[PDB]
Symmetry: T
């Protein structure tokens, strides 16, 4: 017991209310993106349907794993996520996805915009998150990298060169 | 030969009522999946881990269920709406509460909400079956799986 | 606005006593079939031993998965299964499997008869089950299909020309 | 105690009408698989790869389906005929054309071929269900799987 | 050179006493598996899920074990009897009770049932080892595996 | 310095009409074999049913993979396969598979004869194929090897002493 | 060779003695945590035994992978780890784990405390590690994230709400 | 304080020459069995060819794994195996496998006799092996168990009523 | 015995011409793999995803191809040179352009460069086969695989 | 029936001597695993990679071994102590040195320490076997596996 | 739509030309390392050939995944990679790999130097990359960690202690 | 239409000379596998582990190869002889020596044994190819695989 601490209770790192709020912002936009991605996945029609149909599911998988990561990171830091439908709809920054069947061209533009909005949220909170807890900023970097890759993989369809 | 002579052969298309009935199932499955994740993250207390894990299995089932229904709608020339505003405004599920919740409360809450989801499917079943028995089979898989989830979750709170 | 239900307690579907009894009938024949299938698997000897030995294990696997399906369906619908040895022996409708070694030809006939008996139980309760709960009848269809396939794969050894 | 005392208990035998109804399904599933491969090899043009790949998935499903139907026939002591001459002579599917075909044309042709196959299953469905509901469930799986493939393929040509 | 010149060399034959000793092990392993499933389905209450899951692991082990014993019997030209009537008539395990049972009760009941099964193996061990040490090693695997399951189950009720 | 070619358009190897026709001959016999293999797989009954039932499926798998190989080799070399039912029936060299159930012994002989016929087609076109394109002849060697192995595994049931 | 360096020997990045010492601190606490985790895994008894038994093994797996990561990172940077039992016991900051069987409730509190002590060590050295080598700080972030998740998954058992 | 041993050189368990010779006896019969098993696998023809063909390969797999186990156990205990063809032929106790094709019925009897012979060697050396090294006798028990299972699975083809 | 009496037995060694011929194949396979990755990253436009993915499959094939050839050289006592300066100075492939490129242009470009690579292999084939038929078989696998890639890629740009 | 009538049936419990003997094995397995990792990280020199890798395999074996023994103790109502202070104070293994060590030195060191570990198991074997043969089988697996590791490691330093 | 943005087009984060140039530097050295690694993998001979042969392939796998990561990160950020042979040869900082067979000892020294040159490039651009986009710096940290591990695993062969 | 009307079509029969040529390949592949194992067990010294491991990979390849050849014989109605006495009596490989051997010696010995095996395949190649080119392709796989193993093994002793 030469260097052994003798405390009965050793408490964990707790997130500030600001930090909790910042992760909550990321969470709702990740959930909204997952819901919009599925909507697009189902309703996309037209030239190169299959590629887009498939890529949109990969986007959804990533955004879902991301939302679970953020929410559980909140839990680890003694914060409380709210991923309920009403909260997501009321607080998401993503422009609304339109109803009905949409062409592959339209879906490419729509989804690129919504991914970019999501990435913007993460980029906006990044410095405040990093200042308080660099380990959480690393989770943000994974999200930024993965989502920006998805945006490139989707938007390239509409590029005329 | 017995070969048909039509250059174009069309598929079975669902009635508006049929599409509307699948839409009802869809929003309740999506809502259940969102509430399941909420519960999964925020459950605390005795037997946390079991409930945390089971809730993820519920969510997995509800998500594949929503996809199954939405794609069945698409196959039948109906158009699903799984957007957050639509889900929130049209789900029949009792609202799941915010904040940390005890294991016992989560068991009771989620059981009610699974039962609400099964009720929607059972309510639309006969109208769906009458128009398209193949879709009713998909409904049966959902009823079976969700009722299995209800049993696996609720049993925690059962006394003798 | 909101279609949300307001009850704090929504109950699940509860099977009638008759429905419970009907699934219990299926359950005991499936367990008995599993036990007889293993008996035959160990004790078969003669021409084409290996094929029958192997096929019998596939039958046992299917019947075991089936009994779990039925028993858990009972539990889901607030019915209580009884798969105990005494109950199975006292209430199964299958003819007893004979003792000791049996020839491949005899095992083929014996097991085919026992599958047919098991399927007959499922067919007998089907309409009453389907009328109360269509979703459970679908599980019965899976059992009927899978077992009648086993009966074909086993019986065909003895079918001539 | 409750043990039946007969030494031979017969299984369920399909009527010859039932056998013939499943035979109708079988030949169209086989024809669909062969046309599917023809399309898979010979498709050219804009979005070749997706179509090439999706067509193989259709063929996998149709081949599993023909196995399922033929084996169900055998289970009920009917006897399938999936020989080339029989399939050509009795399939209801319009002939697939020869030579290379554009992706747009293949989309339309294959959608029609899938729809014709589903139509056969839908046509025999009630007669099959009346004699054996367990077989009708297999038909439901086929209907669902095939109509999903029709949606996944035809969507390429959909303009909105 | 060192080649034996007899055309038929007989294998090791188990005595009928040895066969009977393995038969004792077999019926208790089968009874344990059936009681294990009964428990797995009918357990309710605090920590349901863990017990539900652990009980299935016990059943998997007991089923693999009964296969091992019955196949060892056959290898040595003994003939197993795992029929329901025989198992019910000759098992040494106390009967599992009917109906839903609390997790606490199931823990105690199943621990007792496992211990009874191990006791049978321990009782025949020396007689089995004396005739065939290779079979005794299979008994050792069973003892180790079953006592591990007893520990994993009973620990739930242990108060310290 | 640089060995780089300067053409903007380098064409691929194009098969002669004769070469295309030779691979077409192989293709139709492989498809016909696959169809007959399944027929036999469903309709075989009698002593050692299961082994033959299972082996026939392995044959069908090999023949199906083979037909895809040949058809795609045709496509690679700018030839156009025809695997349609009417063409296969009208142009296959295999004797017709008989209708209805057949005994294990008969299926063994029937299918062995049909494999032998399929291999004979491949052997007949081999030299002409090898002379134009050695790489395609190698694919033929794979087919010859794999099918003659199937013929051994199936025929040996009927071989005595 | 337009931008090619012409040095025969190009040396790697070497950790300072302070950096080596900082990683050594993390290493001993990760090893101590793995040893305490196993002790808890074996000796935990009581209500919800299985969940805790299983979670404790997941903790041990993570802490073991973590110690290997830290030690090998030391090796890469020309530092030398010491993970020997005497060194771990003499230099760990973790409060000693008690002997004998312990209740699930006690184990939850004990292990949460020990995880939190381990995380505290990583958090304490983080800034010095990051200042010298940001790539190693990223390995620390993985550890912080994974361990804090484990603490949440374990401690939640004892939460009364 | 410390129970640590102080020797810099601690030697391992070394087998007696007799022990080495006993394992060598097991080794050559296992290799011979593997070689004969393959011979039978290639050369069997007749009723139920496929089942025997397949089962013989499982026998060969088991016997090959067995020979490696024994040979490596020898190496561990400072004994030196000899698995060379000349040694195996000159010292195996198994009757020679006959040349050319053999019927399924004959292969069943022939291979069953050869397994019985292999097991008899293991049974003959068992007590002497167990007395010197119980851990090696356990490996023998695995061989006895696995081979006698193979003998059952193969011989049962020829067992009547 | 028929045992050979040589203490040392040497392996087949390739002629300088043979090694030179495999070297020619090697640099063109490496160049193709590097151009394939360039195209994979920089392709944009209609059907981007299909082409992006197919190009990775081409690269995978060319990389395993280069390894196969280089190691065959090693087996035969020849010494490969796959260094960047050597590849750049000695490849016969038309240079792949820098910057973003449309799907249609990438199809045409890569098809030409695959065909150039196949041409090298076909050009050395007879000299390789004459010296060592076993190596010609490796060449056949490369010809087959690359020509399959050419077909899968070029079909995108094919019109009716 | 042959059913036993006891409501409670107890399991086999180990003597204090037996628990003490397994404890002796446990600390030496844990010590070996810790020394194995030390060696794995700090080995340098000729054939580094082989030794680095083999040492991880040794560690894997010793860790699963320690778990096996500790859980066997638990099954038998004994209480393991695998804490660092206990391991350090009670292990019989010669101390592994600090700092980088050559491959040849690591081979010699680890071989000695494996042999020390095997010696503990062999020293307790007969007392363990006499009380509970099933546990002796677990000991045999450890002796076999560790002695295999000793051979695979030491062979590096063997001269002709 | 309470927090919903109402922009039709939301643009992504775009890398500066300096940032694009910095990632390009990393890319060419990763590709050069992969090409040199394979050259070494093929041509290494002598004492401990196999270990080095195998480790060199692991190095190549990592460097290849790394180059794909960097290039695609460039694409995501609207930069354009150039991984062509001429560009790699003209702009790599790695000392040239020698021609012909090389001893294992020489290869160890050569490859360690080339890995270290590659790591130096990443370390040199790190701060500028991190200042502009911390998410990309995290990708750099993965590369630094993985490559420095490879250098340790390779160089340790030549260490005399 | 194009259907052949004969009821029995014979397959390709190997001549007895062809059978004998494959038999030569078979015995050397078997001898190589047995010598490979001998080496694998008995190799000691510097870089033991790599050699131990590579020798097992050689044996796996040689065993798959002997199966391939024996099965090709059977496919063409030849009859293999892989019995120990036949292999010892007719193999062309120099005898592997008894006892422990250094890694350096094993490298040289095994390289020679591989080269002798390849030589047999190369010797029969043209006679085999003339009668059946499909079999010659299997010989090519063996040549390529074995010469790869020779390179991977001998490189250990190569000084440059
Ligand atoms: Cl795709
Ligand atoms: Cl089989
Ligand atoms: Cl769990
Ligand atoms: Cl290795
Ligand atoms: Fe229905
Ligand atoms: Fe269904
Ligand atoms: Fe149904
Ligand atoms: Fe060839
Ligand atoms: Fe940072
Ligand atoms: Fe990271
Ligand atoms: Fe960072
Ligand atoms: Fe033992
Ligand atoms: Fe050739
Ligand atoms: Fe080939
Ligand atoms: Fe023993
Ligand atoms: Fe054992
Ligand atoms: Fe989907
Ligand atoms: Fe279950
Ligand atoms: Fe294909
Ligand atoms: Fe081995
Ligand atoms: Fe390689
Ligand atoms: Fe454990
Ligand atoms: Mg596409
Ligand atoms: Mg058979
Ligand atoms: Mg629990
Ligand atoms: Mg080595």
């Amino acid at each position: 017991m030469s260097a052994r601490r003798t405390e009965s209770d050793i408490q964990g790192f707790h997130a500030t209310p600001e930090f909790g709020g910042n992760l909550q912002k990321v969470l709702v936009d990740l959930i909204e993106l997952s819901l919009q991605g599925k909507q697009a996945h189902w309703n996309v029609v037209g030239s190169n349907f299959r590629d887009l149909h498939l890529q949109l599911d990969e986007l959804v998988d990533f955004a879902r794993e991301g939302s679970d990561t953020i929410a559980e990171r909140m839990r680890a830091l003694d914060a409380v996520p709210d991923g309920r439908s009403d909260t997501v709809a009321a607080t998401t920054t993503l422009p609304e996805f339109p109803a009905f069947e949409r062409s592959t061209a339209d879906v490419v533009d729509l989804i690129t915009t919504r991914i970019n909005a999501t990435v913007d949220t993460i980029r906006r909170v990044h410095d405040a998150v990093d200042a308080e807890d660099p380990s959480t900023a690393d989770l943000l970097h994974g999200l930024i990298d993965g989502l920006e890759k998805q945006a490139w993989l989707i938007r390239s369809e509409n590029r005329k060169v």
